[PDB]
Amino acid sequence: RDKAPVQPQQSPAAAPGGTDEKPSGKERRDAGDKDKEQELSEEDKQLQDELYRPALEELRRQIRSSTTSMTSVPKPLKFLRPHYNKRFAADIISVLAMTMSGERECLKYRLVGAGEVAKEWQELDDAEKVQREPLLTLVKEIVPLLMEIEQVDMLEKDIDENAYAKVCLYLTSCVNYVPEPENSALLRCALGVFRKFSRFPEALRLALMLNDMELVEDIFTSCKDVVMLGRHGVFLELSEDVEEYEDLTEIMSNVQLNSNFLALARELDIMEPKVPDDIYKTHLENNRFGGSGSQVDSARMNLASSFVNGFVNQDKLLTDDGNKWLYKNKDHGMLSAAASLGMILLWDVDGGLTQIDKYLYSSEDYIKSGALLACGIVNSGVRNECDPALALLSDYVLHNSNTMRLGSIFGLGLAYNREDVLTLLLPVMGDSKSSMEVAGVTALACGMIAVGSCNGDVTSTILQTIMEKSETELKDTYARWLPLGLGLNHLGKGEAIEAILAALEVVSEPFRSFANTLVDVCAYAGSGNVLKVQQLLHICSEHFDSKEKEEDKDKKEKKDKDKKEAPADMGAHQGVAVLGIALIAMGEEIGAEMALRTFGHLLRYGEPTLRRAVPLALALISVSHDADPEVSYNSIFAARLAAMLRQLAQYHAKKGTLTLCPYHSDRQLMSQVAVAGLLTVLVSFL
Amino acid sequence: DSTYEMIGGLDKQIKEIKEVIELPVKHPELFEALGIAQPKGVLLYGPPGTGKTLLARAVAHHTDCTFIRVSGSELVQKFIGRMVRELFVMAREHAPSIIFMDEIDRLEGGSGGDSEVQRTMLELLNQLDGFEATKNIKVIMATNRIDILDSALLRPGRIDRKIEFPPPNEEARLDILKIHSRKMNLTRGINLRKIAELMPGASGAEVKGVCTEAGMYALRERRVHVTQEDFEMAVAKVMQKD
């Protein structure tokens, strides 16, 4: 109404005028006021004019919070000692304590790095646990300092709203916006709220991020005491990495309390539900073995038939199509066909034994070496094939045990901090045979053995292979496939300064500097590090045309979650190598129309490197639009490389390290055909 | 200009039209919490309210937008311009704009070319109904004369806005007559209240009829100031044609 009678009431500094003028402002404070508090010019004298001081400070913070301010608002609150669903408390708590506590917690967050913000933040904790605004009191209480049990002090009744909402948006913003040191508080405090509550599988994801044995032990006794099982066994073994399944198998090798954790959770039981169900509910037609088995010629379409047969495992007709199919192909086809029968038998240990035993101790080198490779692929927990393979590897100059070292060490590395096989691979690293694939499957073997190490390791094994790598700067393929195993050993770091150590000792001529930038590829697994985005755009114009391929190829691994930022204008440039960086950086996800849209322009190219590289990611990111793009490949094409690869994509057209290693090691296909002997035994498929 | 100092008497209708026209002007953030779109327009059917255009030029004058009519009554017919795309290009370049036809407010040729203009605005409503270049593009119809049947028949109030406008506020007879008395030389001993309230039944055009038909007696007697008796004679001079 009219402010004429009540306007000059606040001007007299008399105590009665305050003790009756202030209760009027408290009465009219239910909706704030009739206006935006234009009386600042008449209350700026009462600003400094102070028994009943909390009411004058309350009105002062009310008007200063009403019109505008940035620091002077929460001071009457911290000095006031606050005392004394409607609209009054909902406003002055919700929005006035929202902006008020927001600017106080922010100014105290960036100002000092006292219990005022703690006790007052707990008072707001209770007040907002009474008002119960979802995801807003949370989204504002994200950055408030404490990062402690306060969540369990709030997680009493609202479990699905705080878990689903708070863990959803705070996990997405905790992997995209919030850095790692607070993400550790998400892992431990989420270990608390989810350990004390239900919904075990999300705590199992907290074990996918923590990689600790106490979480899986507590969830195996808490999940063991409450009695389906096969499903969480399946994604239990799928979700667990190389560390916590051997630590898990050592604590369960200690007690396990059930005989079902070793007996059930030891081996063959993640595949024991898969094979018979896939044979029963699904049935593949014979037109794939008929066509892809009928247009084989030129010793390369037969290699495509070794890809189809090699990765087929319902039907096993081409396997039992007599003999001489292995002899008609080349040596790499002898390895591919010798390893196909081992890759199709990830079940029936006795059957795989009685099927691969024939190729063992044969007369040819690649039949027995691919036979030991098959023995390494058929199983991953039997480890009884170690002695016959490793017993003969000590030759050091030239023998069949070098190819048997390729297959034996590669398959044995796929089967698995194992110290015995690594100390036996130390003379292999010291040997440095002319065949690069020796150190290839050795460095990749021990690398995949050592993925997920806590903050990496600076041990004398990889330090020794770094010294031997610096010994002679020849055969750069060593400087390409050795940083693979090095970076795989550096995998699992959380705060390792090993990348800076490599930036101290390793920095040399651009070969070992390319090894250093490979360590940089295995050094940015993901956090809030926009400095690497602006530094990435600053380094995008480097003269060296390979560290851009790998360091920029890391894009698909770093931002693999937030896919909205991945599409850019990299294709519109002239650096076709960058077009391959995006072409590989597409990924293996559900394959939105934007990715296939990039495959539309990337598909048509003249060089066989990009034309050969496009169908791999094209059919990996789309695994039912599979037939029309292949017709497009037939319209563009109609050399032998594009034909073998186009039949390969004809076959396979239809966050674990085991599925990330094979293609990252497959990023070196633009070389001799020797890689095709290892291309057929990739483990990235299921 | 015809600002608020030259138009008055529709306080409730401008209070209701500020949400139709003034919504994309100063508060467009309600698109999420409300979910509103761009309607066709608004129209006022009934007698001429003596200022049917001063309101569109008033809201357009306060919106700080241009006024581009279709029929081109005052040298704006060929200045912009198949003569159908140039209006949409100028509407694309000038996003804030208010369209209001004034000249349209034989049955063989007049309805032929007039039917070509009606087809022009129909296909313009088809283009604007299908796609849209920019916002703040609204058309306003005029139904005040007798020969207006297409706009009143094609707009019943199903997908458009309708306002019953026979008795606007009685200020279309009183206070806009006072405004029309402010422009011309007015004395100080006049009482427009009784002479403005004692003109019922005939029409709403009593303002323009009494002013323009009173200018013949102010032109006959050559009085330097308009008296109330002149308007009193103008009441009869406009009621004789009824």
Next chain:
Amino acid sequence: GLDNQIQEIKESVELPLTHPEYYEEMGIKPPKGVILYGPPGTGKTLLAKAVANQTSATFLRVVGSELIQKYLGDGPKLVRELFRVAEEHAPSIVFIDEIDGEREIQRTMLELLNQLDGFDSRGDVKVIMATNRIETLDPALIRPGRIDRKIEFPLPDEKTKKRIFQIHTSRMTLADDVTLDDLIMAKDDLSGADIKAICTEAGLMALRERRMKVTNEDFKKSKENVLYKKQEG
């Protein structure tokens, strides 16, 4: 309450050009399309049903057949232009809405009948028909267009308008007294633009007092204008 219906017809319209292993190898080939219709019409119900295909595809919209009566009887030449541009633009979806002397209308209707069937054309594009009432049009247009399956607009099953109301009110501010069962149950044969219209005028009417939250009494008070307007004429 139509998720199984929209996924059934969605699979019935997405089988061409996508998922080809169960489209041409097994020999489905429905090269005729479907025909739709809505009792409320307004194009927003059928537009909200067929809008699921407009997400990632090329769409063509031709509403009404007034372009034949408003001018001389040029004939089906415009349909032939749409046919040749549909052949030059095969990756698209044909959709016609508001399908509403006498010897010429019958011969252009039979010529449009044979043209719509496509006797000399195989599966190249999908054609979907739409109109206000299927009973007003002649039943001869059924065999060329609808040869696979037809669907009618369901009743207020309290789940369709509840899901649409949830989508429109996913970020709105409503009071606790605003119940849903009386709203989704009281309404009968109302499209999305009607509930969106009463929510829009409800928020605009609640804005008259600077109230960012809409109450139930103001929602029904705003609904009185639509319920009174539809019964006035």
